Amino acid sequence: QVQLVESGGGLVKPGGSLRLSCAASGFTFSEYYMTWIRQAPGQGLEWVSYISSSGFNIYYADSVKGRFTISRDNAKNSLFLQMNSLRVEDTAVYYCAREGVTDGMDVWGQGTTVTVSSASTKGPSVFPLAPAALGCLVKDYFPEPVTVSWNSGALTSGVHTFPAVLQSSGLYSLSSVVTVPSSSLGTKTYTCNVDHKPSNTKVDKRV
Amino acid sequence: DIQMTQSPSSLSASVGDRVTITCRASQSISSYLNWYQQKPGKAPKLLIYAASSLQSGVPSRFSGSGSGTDFTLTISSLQPEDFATYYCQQSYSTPPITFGQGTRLEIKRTVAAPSVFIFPPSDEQLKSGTASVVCLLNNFYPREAKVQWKVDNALQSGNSQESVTEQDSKDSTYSLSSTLTLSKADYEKHKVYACEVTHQGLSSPVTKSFNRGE
Amino acid sequence: KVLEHVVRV
Amino acid sequence: IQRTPKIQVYSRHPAENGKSNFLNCYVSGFHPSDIEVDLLKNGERIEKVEHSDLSFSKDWSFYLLYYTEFTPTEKDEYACRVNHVTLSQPKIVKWDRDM
Amino acid sequence: GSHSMRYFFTSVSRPGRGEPRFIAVGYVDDTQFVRFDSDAASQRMEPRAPWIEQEGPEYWDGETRKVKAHSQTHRVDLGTLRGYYNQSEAGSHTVQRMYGCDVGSDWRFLRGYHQYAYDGKDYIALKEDLRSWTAADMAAQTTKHKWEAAHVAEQLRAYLEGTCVEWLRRYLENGKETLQRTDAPKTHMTHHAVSDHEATLRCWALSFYPAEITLTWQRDGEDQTELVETRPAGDGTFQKWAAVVVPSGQEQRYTCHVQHEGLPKPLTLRWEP
């Protein structure tokens, strides 16, 4: 079975460098051309680079010319992308795509994530949101993601966790709300469990 | 440098309808057009190649036609697993390879009005030197909604952000939250805060407010 | 051995 | 660009009355590829005939080989009936053991 | 001596009868060793020689996958080529493809080919230097600019100078007892009367290998005659004969000369009554 596997994407700072890889298996690697496609968060597909079967013809996009470098090793079935002088607009998910047997590109990778930022690992701050419905606000954490649960997983109907947005200061923040019956609300007490793995932080908040 | 232009940018349909998406090229690409499909959070997948040929393992309800500069993708009978984003790509040259801007396909239902809530900034955040007000919209359809922030009847702009969930799995509705960010001094300067919500399902703009201190 | 793929006209 | 087949009827080994052998009918040099070939015994059609795979020459014209097992006899007569799109009527070629 | 490996592909459209017909065969020298037929029941690449059956299952899996890719491309090509020549969807048409490689006595690369045809006429072919194409028609010119802008000759050159020669050497090593043999022709001559004043002499050459042979007639040392095409005997050998009509009594003036690489010295036949 034919397939591709990416690896190497992580968290880097502006001006840093990274090296991605794409290991192939199940077919003759030296007879197809390969590409690198990226997709910004919440945007469309965009072509990045291209290299021919034997590696004599190489093309780049206008936005990455002079900073990226693609190459291949036909003896070991491997494809590389050397990224130098990275900018903030280079944050995306990167795929390696093999050409099709007749037309198009019919074999894709699974994708590796590349994050370019100048912020350091920070734990989240949790604030209550009470005026029915109520919730708790997760603010100023880095990097993504956090997992928010209510009553240690006992309250699952009616919970809405919104996608995280990037603030102007480079940090993330999201909200989570729940709709509950007003009479029941006064009696019992709701709490939201936030777990941030990259900072080893756990906060339990009583609303 | 051939520009591909899809239309429309979003289209709502119900299970069992007939769908049609178009892709327009800037110059003549004789028959070099491929269509892809991307489910949220995964890699794309080839459906049609050479503008009319069906990829092996794809249901026969998909079909493509066209040549020259005007192309079409048609679905004869929608299924629950056909709601995704679709792109068109040209194979006529290189460099560059160019894709369409995408067309998202969603589920259609009846109109529902949103429930509007507002939450005042807690004192625990006021201690840190920042004030944040949240206006929440709940379980509405369609997606288009408008939220305006008014501070003592002074219209604000620029310092708000919004987040919209994905279409629900049970009732296919949305939710929205708009956050207003202010400093401590600016929050202490004014008294009355309110968000004005405008939606198709509402007979008139609805406003929720609260008084500072109370 | 046969080719991996051929290019369309 | 439509060509007429060239037919040859022969045997695998030197024909000898009473010894098992094979009968071949070699059609070549035709285009297009659709053709109808049969091997006959006393004018009646033989049923257990096999053939080879369709290939072509340097000038893009096809060729085939049909063969069957038989036993030569001083009284029996063998032949090959061929029909093609370029032939207005079938072509019957008798087996002459000196050719 | 010299050796070669070739692959032949044929695709025939069938309007109103379903999918087109696809056939592929592979040849090493004059011996066929694989075949694929779309109308067969297995839908696999099948072996046609004893020496090729000792390969693993991954070999046959890869072969089946790649031949199906070939058929897919040919099925798009039929449509496109019908589009170019302004033809209707009523008739059936044919596309044919051929490629391979040659090696010398030292088993080193000599030449490679890659050709394409439509309805029995040349369409486009790779030149000898493995970098340019020859298109003798305006539609092939359209195809040729696309193929020269996209560097297809790069893959073809790499394949032909690599994999073709490597696996040809492997095949010649495996089927050594069959592929590297020579069979000298068992030649004889017959005589038939052509009425009162003539006769026909027939020069035979039976069960030789490979198919390359030369049969010429000479009367007192000067070249002159009926020639048949080298025909397969059915079991890995070939046959051929040549005949001439002579006046009666002058049969002792004619001689038949046979040239074959399985012979150390060319043979000469004279009529012996």
User: What range does the domain containing E33 cover?
Assistant: 1-181
E90 phi/psi in degrees, rounded to 5:
-100, -35
Same domain, B130 and B196: yes
E242 and E219, same domain (yes or no): yes
Please report, for the domain that includes residue E208, its CATH number.
2.60.40.10
Tokens 């040729």 belong to which residue?
Answer: E144
Residues E22 and E128 in one domain: yes
Q: With an 8 Å Cβ cutoff, is A103 touching chain E?
A: yes
Do B83 and B145 reside in the same domain of the chain? no
- Candidate from A31, A102, A103 with C-beta closest to C4: A31
Same domain flag for B126 and B88: no
Q: Dihedral, CA atoms, B11, B13, B18, B19, nearest 10 degrees?
A: 20
Whether B173 has its CB under 8 Å from any CB of chain A: the answer is: no
Q: Is E68 helix (H, G, I), strand (E, B) or coil?
A: helix
Instruction: Report how far residue B90's alpha carbon sits from residue B93's, in angstroms, rounded to the nearest whole number.
Output: 8
In terms of phi and psi (left: phi > 0; alpha: psi -120 to 50; beta: otherwise), the region of E203 is: beta
Mutation target vs D (from E4, E7, E9, E10; most D CBs, 10 A cutoff): E10
Same structural domain, E102 and E143: yes
Chains A and D touch (3+ CB pairs under 8 A): no
Pick the last residue of a domain from E132, E164, E181: E181
Query: B88 and B9, same structural domain?
Result: yes
- Residue count of chain E, please give it: 273
Total number of residues shown for chain D:
99
Give a yes or no: residue E1 inside a domain: yes
Q: DSSP letter string over D20-61?
A: -EEEEEEEEEEBSS--EEEEEETTEEPS--EE---EE-TTS-
- Residue D82 pairs with which residues in a beta bridge? D37, D91
Same domain, B99 and B22: yes
Helix (H) or strand (E) holding B124: helix B123-126
Which among A130, A116, A126 has a CA at the least distance from the CA of A166? Answer: A116
Report the DSSP pairing between strands A112-116 and A11-12. Answer: parallel
Chains B and A touch (3+ CB pairs under 8 A): yes
Q: Which residue has the tokens 């987040």?
A: B163
Report d(CA A61, CA A70) in Å as an integer.
Answer: 12
Question: B151-154: which pairs have CB atoms within 8 A and are 24 or more residues apart?
Answer: B151/B190, B151/B192, B151/B193, B152/B190, B152/B191, B152/B192, B153/B192, B154/B190
Distance CA A196, CA A202 (A): 7
Cα of E163 vs its chain's centroid, Å: 20
Distances (CA, A) of E187 to B213, E203, E233, E259, E273: 120, 7, 15, 11, 16
| Residues B97 and B61 grouped into a single domain | yes
Q: Which helix (H) or strand (E) holds E189?
A: strand E189-194
- The angle formed by the CA atoms of residues A107, A109 and A110, to the nearest 5 degrees, is 135
B119 and B103 housed in the same domain:
no
Query: Which of B148, B212, B147, B214 lies closest to B186, judged by CA?
Result: B212
Residue to substitute from D30, D49, D53, interface E, most E β-carbons within 10 A: D53
State how many domains chain E has.
2
Residue E272 lies in a domain: no
Q: What part of A 121-160 touches C (C-beta under 8 Å)?
A: none
Any idea what the CATH number is for the domain that residue B86 is in? 2.60.40.10
What is the residue whose two structure tokens read 């198709």? B200
Q: Does residue E167 sit at the A interface (CB-CB below 8 Å)?
A: no
What resolution in angstroms does the PDB record give?
3.1
What domains does chain D contain, in order, with CATH numbers?
Answer: 1-99 (2.60.40.10)
**Strand arrangement of the beta sheet that strand B174-183 belongs to:** B115-119, B130-140, B174-183, B160-164
Is residue E188 a known part of a binding site?
no
> What string of H, E and C letters represents the secondary structure of chain A?
CCEEEEECCCEECCCCEEEEEEEEECCCHHHCCEEEEEECCCCCEEEEEEECCCCCCEEECCCCCCCEEEEEECCCCEEEEEEECCCHHHCEEEEEEECCCCCCCCEECCCEEEEECCCCCECCEEEEECCCEEEEEEEEEECCCCEEEEHHHCCCCCEEECCCEECCCCCEEEEEEEECCHHHHHHCCCEEEEEEHHHCEEEEEEC
Sheet holding A191-196, edge to edge: A147-150, A191-196, A201-206
The answer to whether residues B165 and B90 belong to one domain is no
Does C have 3 or more CB contacts under 8 Å with D?
Answer: no
* Candidate from A30, A54, A102 with C-beta closest to E76: A102
Pair E129, E243 in one domain = no
E204, part of any domain:
yes
Q: Is residue E116 part of a domain?
A: yes
Quote the domain boundaries for residue B199.
Answer: 115-211
Place of tokens 């708009």: B178
Task: Please indicate, yes or no, if residue E85 is contained in any of the structural domains.
Answer: yes
Residues B158, B204: one domain? yes
CB under 8 Å to E66, separation ≥6 — which residues?
C2, C3, C4, C5
Q: Measured between alpha carbons, how far is residue D48 from residues A149, B42, D23, E190 in Å?
A: 77, 57, 12, 33
Query: A27 and C8 in contact by Cβ < 8 A?
Result: no
Name the segment(s) of chain A with CATH classification 2.60.40.10: 3-116, 125-206
CB contacts of B93 in chain E (<8 Å) are: 149
- Residues A20, A78: Cα–Cα separation, whole Å: 10
Task: Write out chain B residues lying below 8 Å of E80, CB-based.
Answer: 31
E80 touches chain B (CB under 8 A): yes
User: Is the domain of E122 the same as that of E245?
Assistant: no
**Taking CB atoms and an 8 Å cutoff, what residues of chain E touch B31?**
80
| Whole-number Å distance between alpha carbons of E238 and E31 | 12
Using beta carbons and an 8 Å cutoff, which residues of E are at the interface with D? 8, 10, 12, 23, 25, 27, 32, 35, 37, 92, 94, 96, 98, 117, 119-122, 190, 192, 202, 206, 228-229, 231-235, 239, 241
CB contacts < 8 Å between C and E, how many?
Answer: 42
Domain boundary among B107, B138, B171: B107
Q: Which of C1, C4, C5, C7 to mutate to test the interface with E (most CBs of E within 10 A)?
A: C1
Which CATH architecture best describes the domain A3-116? Sandwich (2.60)
Tokens of B98: 């160019």
* Those residues with Cβ within 8 angstroms of residue A199's Cβ, 6 or more apart along the chain or in another chain: A121, A122, A123, A124, A141
- Last residue within a domain, chosen from E140, E156, E181: E181
Instruction: Write out the H or E segment, with its range, that includes residue D62.
Output: strand D62-70
Instruction: Tell me the C-alpha to C-alpha distance, in Å, between residue D37 and each of D41, D77, D92.
Output: 14, 17, 10
Does the beta carbon of E73 lie under 8 angstroms from any beta carbon of chain A?
yes
Which CATH number fits the domain that encloses residue E153? Answer: 3.30.500.10
Please name the residue of chain C whose CA is at the shortest distance from the CA of residue E7: C2
Please tell me the distance from the alpha carbon of residue A2 to that of residue A43, in angstroms, as a whole number: 28
Q: What are phi and psi of A88, to 5 degrees?
A: -70, -30
Torsion angle of the four alpha carbons E64, E65, E66, E67, in this order, in degrees rounded to the nearest 10: 50
Evaluate whether residue E273 is within a structural domain. no
Q: Nearest residue on chain E to D27, judged by CA atoms?
A: E231
Q: Which of E181, E208, E240 is the last residue of a domain?
A: E181
Residue A28 burial (CB count, 10 A): 18
Topology classification of domain A125-206: Immunoglobulin-like (2.60.40)
Does B44 sit within 8 Å of A108, measured CB to CB?
A: yes
D86 lies within 8 A of chain E by CB: no
Contact between A83 and A67 under an 8 Å Cβ cutoff? The reply is: yes
Q: CB-based contact (8 Å) between B84 and chain A?
A: no
- Tell me: do B20 and B103 sit in the same domain: yes
Scanning A75-104 for CB atoms below 8 A from C yields 99, 101-103
Q: How many C-beta neighbours within 10 Å does residue E87 have?
A: 12
Residues ending a continuous segment of chain E before a break (C–N > 2.5 Å): 224
Which of D10, D29, D13 has its CA nearest to residue D21?
D13
CA distance A50 to A32: 11
User: Domains in chain B: how many in total?
Assistant: 2
The kind and range of the H/E element at B38 are strand B33-38
Of the residues B107, B138, B170, which one is the last residue of a structural domain? B107
3-state secondary structure of B185: helix
| Token code pair at residue B208 | 């929720």
Q: Which neighbouring-strand residues pair with A115?
A: A11
Alpha carbon B128 to its chain's center? 34
Same domain, E139 and E196: no
Long-range contact pairs involving E19-27 (C-beta distance under 8 Å, separation at least 24):
E19/E75, E20/E74, E20/E75, E20/E78, E22/E70, E22/E71, E22/E74, E22/E75, E23/D53, E23/D54, E24/C2, E24/E67, E24/E70, E25/D53, E25/D54, E25/D55, E26/C2, E27/D55
Mutate to test the interface with E, among B2, B29, B31 (most CBs of E within 10 A): B31
Residue E252 falls within a domain, yes or no?
Answer: yes
Q: Which of residues 39-68 of D touch E (CB under 8 A)?
A: 53-56, 60-61, 65, 67
Cα–Cα distance, D24 to D52 (Å, whole number): 11
Residue E12 in tokens: 């025939």
Chain E residues with CB under 8 Å of D67 CB are 234
Residues E168 and E186 placed together within one structural domain of the fold? no
Q: Residue E251 and residue E219: Cα distance in Å, rounded?
A: 9
Residue E62 falls inside a structural domain: yes
Task: For residue A127, give the nearest of A195, A192, A32, A196 by alpha carbon.
Answer: A192
| E210 and E155 both lie in a single domain | no
- CA A163 to chain B, closest CA, distance in angstroms equals 6
Spatial CA neighbour of A91 closest among A110, A117, A114: A114
Last residue of a domain, one of B75, B107, B139: B107
